[model samples]
Target: KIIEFIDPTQLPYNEKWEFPRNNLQFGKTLGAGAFGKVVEATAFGLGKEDAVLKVAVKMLKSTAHADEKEALMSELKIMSHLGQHENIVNLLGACTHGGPVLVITEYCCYGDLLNFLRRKAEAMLGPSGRPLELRDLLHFSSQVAQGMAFLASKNCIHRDVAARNVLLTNGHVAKIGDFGLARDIMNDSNYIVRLPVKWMAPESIFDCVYTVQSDVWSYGILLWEIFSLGLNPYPGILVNSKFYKLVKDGYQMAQPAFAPKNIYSIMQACWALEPTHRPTFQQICSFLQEQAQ
Candidate 1:
């Protein structure tokens, strides 16, 4: 295994994947998290070569341990594996040559959907200057399903499926990212807990299991998040033994105030208790486009 970003042509990656380290000029830190700090960096020859662009680069801190490196590489491999898709966050480039790991992605001006939804009622509006409507909310759900439908085809299970992981571009577009906990279809699908109980499917909670449908279950909750405008799932209940019991006995969240009846039906379909009983991403993807019309 040679340097990841140095040998572009040799590695099984596309030309755009093997970025020239010298081309990137690291800038100030925008935010820090479990992996490392995301910073505003300049890509001199990002895609559409020779054109300078403002990008957010996730840089690995020097204090990164072995576990962190694997976590970072996992995302890079997944992003590179999936390549570029419109409904998903596009990986701009990577720099893993002489220094710490640096993975580049399209900078989203609006940040994540969770915070975006929580901000203000008037903040979201139609292009024609009208207030946000039900269709606007459904559009977010559809876009995510489209992206997930793509991921489903690629055989990737985005274990961490939530509004927090969905990044909103400068526009109203939704891109599914944050693949830290993602994995392929596996025979042994036992998983360690990462997020809290509310986001986990009952099987994922009762057993250490996860699957495509498990992710779908979370997406239904993500619908709850979206329509609720960023309120946490299960308004009154905390993630406790009782909460777990309710989930065991087939409890599903009530529809958000803004969610239409049809949209609530979709949510109900997602919480089918049995993973196989849930609708596939491909079906959901087309249903949104076809049914929403």
Candidate 2:
């Protein structure tokens, strides 16, 4: 409820989503980012009072500025409204005791999609210890699209929609995560943010514009990521004026070597120059369904 007083314009805070920092039993560090470090933690208050739950705690650095805290609060608000979905990560609670904030969410045993794909040939294995296949890729892509569709239906825009932002469950099910860059397009259809150059749409790079359609464009790059087995986008192309000029001149990435024609076709549709020309998440999910057959 402390977040309620932080900024009323952002999101109305909920007491149920609040957790006591002292109650969290921190474990191994899962990962770290510019904002903070995520660690494996066990806590009792998140779910059944008598039942201890194993979750991930994203602990923010003590040095984080006010803007960073606001961003974390915004992400919690988005996750709270988005609720539970098969393909989206579930946020359990947050520790808002003023400083050193923490965000608790369900832990994905298999970690991120991009890392899983990068290690599919060796370390990363299915529940049955089998290597990932093209079908698996299609299945994961469909899940991402399904998750994005859910967000789109709620009028939410996920500024970042890359393979790294997707997590894999024990069964290899993909769930979208990282809502630090998400926002609701309540009144206007567009938003502006510092773009993720490698995964951005042309409009985002040129004019700082973002929309559901712009997310579709990022999804196109995600498709390239999945098909190329987690290769970086525009490998040799610098994320500079040249890259922008190239995209403006219709220089989309070539069809991924392992991607099917239909899949590539969907990517091309997502990469259309005009935002209106891009496919919606609903349309994308439908197309992926037919391709998976």
Candidate 3:
């Protein structure tokens, strides 16, 4: 067995979430990251009725260290608390005593938003071959805003909020994914971590401070990605301290081609120099809601 045992103390103070190692039947790989790979899996229940479920299993390497385990446990706890939402990925269950440690979630048939947008840009149509409208963009952005607003209201910060981390269902419904870098704000004011430069706000880039407002800044870059149909942020700018300097000197990304002036204005609001000046996700959602209508 890749995972021999699961210590309850390592998990949250809640119900048991153990699954049989033999129950998982792995299929094709879905995606990969530095920590692990996600694969399609069929999970058979232990009951006499023999229920089955199709799940996307995120399998961590057996060689993973204690810190990784702790982080996954924390992620599961947060997901459990988050429950179900139309715009947030659903965490189904997990398996420790398995071929590989796993974090199972509902599979998004259409894949991540970044790839979807890229395909849309190339063909000028989505997976269903339907041309994307301005209203479609606004609706997608609103769903992301709704997800972020929900997280903000719960005092949680998704440190990595970008198009790459948003998943899309077959219906083009956008749901926020990737909680590996997320943190709850119930205790501390902020925690320091390496920032993704292009998507980072000025305060976050300099002070390593993370907050919901900083996430709002990242959301602005995400808006750019959506409007540009997955174009990289700051196309020519170098990814170094020089880039940070330019931003600090009031350099902001130009409005995407064909993006509405009002949408561009919203992006500018999110990129405000002072964190306090940035709008909350709830406010962004409200603004997008008005635009959509």
Candidate 4:
């Protein structure tokens, strides 16, 4: 399939309205960030009044920063190619006008997993509370592992898989999003981009190469997020300074929280210093399945 990056003015889309009138009414802003805003909109183009109207509109910020443009465009390229992935966030359509580009996606009512969990914990537990229950962690991780397995099968390596990048619908089903740091491993010609140092794998921290193995390293931290109910994976961790220290001191993520010995071993497998030691998504999925029984 041919994928084209287009400017809004050049798009067949109507630039005057965020979504065409053919589309139904969108409710509210689900989330927003420094780079863009995401809203819950409806598209009747699909042809169903029974359908619940929900979509996200991400309007990007323009800058002299080359990296920002590349990041946004890269996400668009990945989304264009990734169609109808139950685990991956669905891309409905997009609008590009002038400086800022708009991306319309399926609306996720549950919001981001990290933020959602944080709120859940705040209401249930005290502000300083740790609300990560074992069952909750296992359930969340199992869904995530399944999603990652699907992506891995497609030759996509989610270099920056984290709680913040995951969205839960109906407050339980997890859908992975944010592909800026993701790479199509099948296409090795594309240069690997660095992720935040805190989540950085030792191999990626030292050298700019990404593999399924390194991705598993990130997944390990994500598992930690589910276990922590969205606590910072590397809280109190500085960027490059602490990262170098881990490299120098041979530090790796400690035992995963709230799991028994067997699951702990599985978690350790994900955080293996030598990326090769990490299990494939298939392996992780099978393990989760076994644990569920």
Which has the greatest TM-score?
Answer: 2
For candidate 3, give the lDDT of residue 271: 89
Shift in Å, residue 275, candidate 2: 0.8
Q: How many angstroms is residue 289 displaced in model 3 relative to the true structure, after the best TM-score fit?
A: 2.3
**Top-down lDDT ranking:** 2, 3, 1, 4
Model 3 TM-score, 2 decimals = 0.84
CA RMSD of all predictions: 6.7, 6.3, 7.2, 7.2
Candidate 1 lDDT over 94-188, as tens digits, reads 87767777788888777777777776464654333346567777888899999988887776777668887788886688988873422222201
Residue 269's lDDT in candidate 2 = 93
Off by over 4 Å in 1: 1-16, 122-130, 179-193
For candidate 2, list the clashing residue pairs, or say none. none
Q: Which stretches of candidate 2 lie over 4 Å from their true place?
A: 1-9, 48-50, 122-128, 179-194
For residue 139, give model 3's deviation from the true position in Å: 1.3
lDDT of each: 0.74, 0.78, 0.76, 0.64
Off by over 4 Å in 4: 1-27, 47-52, 62-71, 96-100, 126-133, 179-194, 240-242
Alpha-carbon lDDT of model 4: 0.64
Candidate 4 per-residue C-alpha lDDT over 1-293 given as tens digits, one digit per residue, 9 for 90 to 100: 11242342232333323434345465675554444445566766542334545667665534225665555655665666555666778776665544455566766777778777778877775645345566766777787888888776666666677777888886567888773422223222222243455565787777866777877888887877776666675566555565687754666555545557777677678878777778998898888877765
Provide the TM-score for each candidate, comma-separated: 0.85, 0.87, 0.84, 0.76
Q: For model 4, give the 10-residue run with minimal summed lDDT.
A: 181-190
Candidate order, TM-score descending: 2, 1, 3, 4
